[PDB]
Amino acid sequence: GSSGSSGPLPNPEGLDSDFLAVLSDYPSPDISPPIFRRGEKLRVISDEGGWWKAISLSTGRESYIPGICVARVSGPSSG
């Protein structure tokens, strides 16, 4: 039972990160299981040319998907 200790949050609590909304679940159900279902929001972890790394704020799965498969989110509407 790891004891450890609770410290400060990782979030930059100042600079917002780039989010990418899954335009279409990927990969396809014919090649592999989709790590980020459509409509799912993901946080931009790293940018590598046309392909970047992101993680789902719902499941917390780290995977690499093509920007085309996702959409650069700007912000909410109802608040």
For residue 76, the domain's CATH number is 2.30.30.40
Please count the other Cβ atoms lying within 10 Å of the Cβ belonging to residue 63: 15
Which residues, including other chains, have CB under 8 Å from residue 13's CB and lie 6 or more apart? none
Give CA–CA dist 77/79, Å, rounded.
6
Phi, then psi, of 54 in degrees rounded to 5 = -150, 160
Strand pairing category for 41-48 and 19-22:
antiparallel
Give the residue among 38, 76, 45 at the shortest CA–CA distance from 60: 45
* Residue 62: domain span: 1-79
What's the structural domain count of the chain? 1
CB-CB contact of 43 with 17 (8 Å): yes
Decide: helix, strand or coil at residue 6: coil
